[PDB]
Subunit: 417 residues, 4 copies
């Protein structure tokens, strides 16, 4: 543990300062024997847990057979199979018609390829983004990202090409934030340049687990159709079954014009990403956008295996909704306890993307560091880090689930004397 | 092929010039479902400097998967990351006299350039970044300001890039004109148009730009210009690094020490997505969490990358073998260039190590040669601004047999097109 | 004529007022056609003392006769020293305003450009907060704070940068406080608002459609600005120089901005002219970071210093503007009364002699405005739709002409019906 | 008289260079309250090309005021507006055979440059604008992107400019080097770094930049380069216009006809803010109202501008008179320059017409001579990337007595400063 070598732009080796060894399911091991229940799961990257056996076999068998790893754009059997499976298993049973673009294997890369697409498809530079939205930190993505910490660090380069509307609930309760947006769309001097696209998370991740209301989602969708705006849904953290459906926008029965995916798309933790799009929007011309690792064949293999093993029927999906309910129940209890001790707290979320909003980052950091000492890995989000996220693996055993929540509850109580 | 055509976006390029379905890959040979077989002179655009699926790297990767090691470490500390950083220091940096620290952005070349220039801009409190004619450093909006190609910059959707100034690269202004004198003057000039730059980003041998090797005197002078004016020197070694030029770091040929180095492509050794930024230790200006990205701790790349460094770079045998093979290509590329000129069609050769280029006149003759080579079983791509430089990006590990075999297919293919 | 071929097709006031004008005095203009016209436009608030006021004419002609320097660059002239002393003795010191003067170029866009540049340098922040419907000029920098879409889309491929829009008072509806949304974003790390160096506002929005800000609203903004370390920039280019019944339109609320821009009626004679008022501590400029050739335009110095002494040496002018404003309000009300009881709803707004009749649509206001020109009244519109007919008559206007002008618009409205 | 120091911002620049109170001015002589009298070789940085308060224009102005003529016309047609478009077409454009229409922006040179490059971007549908080293074209944000001076560009408060690329101006790259070749190469290089411009903006003699006169060949090649690659030519005649170079338009020396022309400084002849944009009629892309400017119809400027075209440009007498005085200025400057060169301080004369410059070593010598000249009765300032160039910008109408008079104070001041 003498890593003087890594930069000072670290995050997770200051919060959880140990050397991790092996991993399976939701259990992680460290060099000193210690074992941890994982409610972080790589920030929503391990929706199927660490090193799932069916994925681990598919990947290994492919490596053993000397399947090409680095394909760039080239057709390969893995790529063909991936697109086959995604259309057969996911897209068609949900009535969705999309073509796939593969950009660089990162969320920010998908986001940059989606907004650039939208900009070219409509002839307009402006992207409407939402309060507390996170979408990545590359200069292009960064324009849609609201966090001052990232934005103040560019080095003298103001972002451009993006306008912020208030997300659902930002002005109170009941207050329609979309009506302000509707008025700005119709006001020539309002200050809102006509957007090529609205970009939205259905449940805001880094922004503090803020799940958009279904009627709100549906009205935004009609607002877009009525105003020649593509709806980009960023399903990079909320998707791949995290909110209890495969795509988080299923709950509202909307069909977004463009969808980005990344984190758990590969199932194993392999860097992977893509951008679904309605066919007619495929206005790209050959080679206008690229990225060395746009053809990561190993990610193709584990993604196909994950779709076939988990999304062939509704069983898994319905088991996430059910696991969500228990996390929801035990977070509400925790907010009740905190509230009655005179520290206001509340619960929100959707599926297994759930949040315990304590007062302030100082309280959340106490509850979190204590849970780490007690054997649970859980982390924060929100503008202040005041929301304790459940981002556990969707596959988590019931013992490991109730086992992690117990450790959380014990840690809250220990913090509260 | 009917699922791949109907469902993949039309932005694709490599499935267009190579319209077959690849399956197995080993060394410098690729297989297709139709029974065709290919010698790979493209190596994923220099991403597979050790060939496809190298035995030694494959076994290290499979062991790690079998033992259930953590794949996605986020940013936490793992044994794979320790072994990577220590291997990096002992095998690579220390014997080269290099004192750097390591920062891990997204597993992407653009992502590394973006962090690199963002770090330079905070270090110096200046926003402008000086770049050179024909440089490519990525397509995400931050990097694109330093990337020269109009086909990308015109597809931004109406956002003009911001933050970069373009300087004439070595040789751009004819022979025997030192382009750095122009640059040196603009720096001293209050109304000359150059916002004072935090950093200069450069490829020692330009990739997409047409295989342009900057001369050793030129590079050394640019290093001194950078110190004489408080500018950081960023060397983008994403393509020209990891052995491609005959030394690990391409800038070793000129004995300069940059302040910031970007690496990607061949860093993993296996075709796993990976990148790091190297900084002089004082430059560690970042505050915690100012930059991130989800696939930083990609541990599988830590294993393959550590494995490649110890296996190929624990001594200088491999180094010198690249040097010798680079010379084989230089010879056959020159001879090929003579053939083409003397048939009324001018051509030249340039490059360094196994980063070589055969400059035919125009992008249409080079397409004819490149496509003919594809029908004869050679995978070879063009670079340059018109598409006129046939580049050798064959694996550094290629066997003499497959190297001469690949160059044999090229020459036949060139003679074939002249008919 | 030669006025149709030689003149570029940008022109605005030569498709609505296509006669050739000759002699001009008070609120009366004479055409070549020989007809007279009553001017309820006053150069859109540039001629707050009417065309060619006798006192100013004389001070001007006397100055040209002695051969006083006309163009002094930056030089100290006697006319420059006089303007500063008069503004000091007659305007600033009696209101207890402590202000330095910076003279930019003689456009109004040039003053806003110098005001926001000053604010950014003072506060070390690039972002400027602007309001829905505001208008502050169309050069590329001032253009970033202007709301109008017809200007921002005509930049030819360059998006604006360094400005964010907040809802102006009332924009979100009845008895909703739009500054509560603004205060929340300031405290929200990721609400998407880069921390402003400055707010820039018109107390009554000119082009936006004659939108008077509430006095408590203005008072709360000033509170928010000091509490959050932001300069308050009041753009009094149109609503200034006694247009709202006080010399500074912010005098109604008792606040004191940090930076005040003036231009239109500053000369008092149609001379191009503008300045930036700034609290002394904010004088962060280094010698010569902002030039502009017609800096020291001594002809305007003469006419602006004469107008101040003549009209603003006491209370009388002030109060007769307030009275004339109440006349206009009584008729605009009676006219919105008429129009509504015929199924065409309308309303009156304003403050002082900056009032507007808000008829329903732009195309209806266009009939009335065009019809008024047929009956001998020049009157133009503003608003996002062109919705609002504005009263921007001179403040010196005689009661015969002010009544005469309103009788023409009253008739011209009836004819439209 | 110390309230001009208290009530005014410290942004002032010509308040510190000449700290007296000026009262009455006529011709090239300015009176002070101190009763001191000054010869003006500055004239509003070239804004009084017919001297201070020319009597003929003074009369035309006085009579329009006396008649209660409309001063602020916005955009409405008026007498004084029609007469200005008439006399411009009749006395100026047609005799020179030029087909131009007029946009009236706000009455500043920045506002003119902004309208022109904004218009150019709309006509060609491209955002980039090529400008040249040491170019100066205004300090509002849009014109600022084309301006070279760091001192203004560092003062924007964290906002980098956007939409402009810099090319080396004629002679920048040394003795006998055609900088335009570099330009043409970048125009055809897909990844050279230049976004394909909508237009090129240039001063035929660079004003603020240090009196750099582009050559006639060079200007003619740049016209050909623009017409070939589909680029408008804007010529920025704010300072070098209205006769200063020997011709009404400084581009007459080269016979080229630009697609866009900007005028402001001396355009009204009387020191009144005023500016127009000259375009070819087919370039009137504008839709109604897309560009604003309150003080566009400033009719008092129409009056004096027309009166000055009639009184000064009806024959070619005046225009050759200035060409004559340019040579007596040119002569003495070379004398003064050979003097300092022989006293061990190299210097040089350059210019064209009555835009002339004496280039000394540095700004500190410039400032010493400039300051001495003020004590001896001559108002003269500098320009250049360091203010190393003592610029002559006396009125074109200066009498021979005052022109040799001013030239004599300058010579006296240089020898005093030396020995
Ligand atoms: C390959 C290339 C890049 C691009 O990096 P990506 O991973 O493709 O985004 C950057 N720099 C150089 C020198 C390159 O050749
Ligand atoms: C995780 C997150 C990202 C981050 O993308 P990277 O792969 O880390 O660059 C982007 N968008 C959303 C919605 C996210 O939750
Ligand atoms: C008129 C207007 C401007 C623009 O001033 P110009 O002289 O036209 O450049 C600026 N601010 C306000 C409030 C305006 O009404
Ligand atoms: C003087 C100058 C300008 C500045 O115009 P202003 O009148 O100061 O607004 C613009 N372009 C050129 C070439 C100049 O010489």
């Amino acid at each position: 543990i003498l890593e003087r070598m890594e930069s000072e732009v670290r995050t997770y080796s200051r919060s959880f300062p140990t050397v991790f060894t092996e991993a399976k399911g939701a259990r992680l091991h460290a060099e000193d024997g210690n074992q941890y229940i994982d409610f972080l799961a790589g920030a929503g990257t391990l929706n199927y847990g660490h090193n799932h056996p069916k994925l681990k076999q598919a990947l290994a068998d492919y490596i053993a057979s000397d399947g090409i790893v680095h394909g760039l754009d080239m057709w390969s059997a893995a790529k063909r199979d991936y697109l086959e499976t995604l259309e057969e298993v996911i897209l068609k049973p949900r009535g969705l018609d999309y073509k796939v673009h593969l950009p660089g294997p990162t969320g920010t890369n998908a986001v940059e390829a989606a907004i650039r697409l939208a900009r070219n498809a409509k002839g307009r530079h402006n992207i409407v983004t939402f309060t507390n939205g996170f979408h990545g930190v590359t200069m292009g993505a960064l324009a849609t990202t609201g966090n001052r910490k990232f934005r103040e660090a560019t080095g003298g380069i103001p972002t451009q090409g993006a306008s912020f509307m208030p997300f659902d609930g930002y002005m109170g309760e009941g207050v329609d934030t979309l009506s302000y947006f509707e008025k700005l769309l119709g006001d020539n001097s309002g200050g809102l340049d006509v957007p090529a696209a609205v970009i939205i998370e259905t449940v805001q991740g880094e922004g503090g687990i803020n799940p958009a209301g279904i009627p709100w989602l549906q009205r935004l969708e009609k607002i877009c159709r009525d105003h020649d705006m593509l709806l980009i849904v960023d399903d990079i953290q909320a998707g791949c079954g995290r909110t209890g459906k495969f795509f988080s926008f299923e709950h509202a029965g909307i069909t977004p014009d463009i969808v980005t995916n990344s984190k758990s798309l590969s199932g194993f933790g392999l860097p992977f990403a893509h951008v679904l799009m309605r066919p007619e929007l495929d206005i790209w011309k050959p080679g206008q956008y690229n990225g060395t690792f746009r053809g990561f064949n190993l990610a193709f293999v584990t993604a196909a295996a994950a779709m076939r093993h988990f999304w062939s029927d509704d069983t898994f999906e319905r088991d996430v909704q059910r696991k969500g309910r228990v996390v929801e129940d035990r977070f509400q209890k925790l907010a009740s306890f905190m509230t009655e001790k005179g520290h206001p707290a509340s619960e929100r979320g959707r599926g297994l993307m759930r949040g315990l909003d304590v007062g302030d980052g100082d309280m959340a950091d106490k509850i979190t560091a204590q849970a780490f000492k007690n054997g649970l890995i859980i982390e924060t989000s929100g503008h202040s880090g005041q929301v304790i996220k459940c981002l556990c693996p969707l596959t988590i055993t019931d013992e490991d689930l109730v086992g992690g929540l117990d450790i959380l509850e014990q840690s809250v109580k220990e913090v509260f004397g």
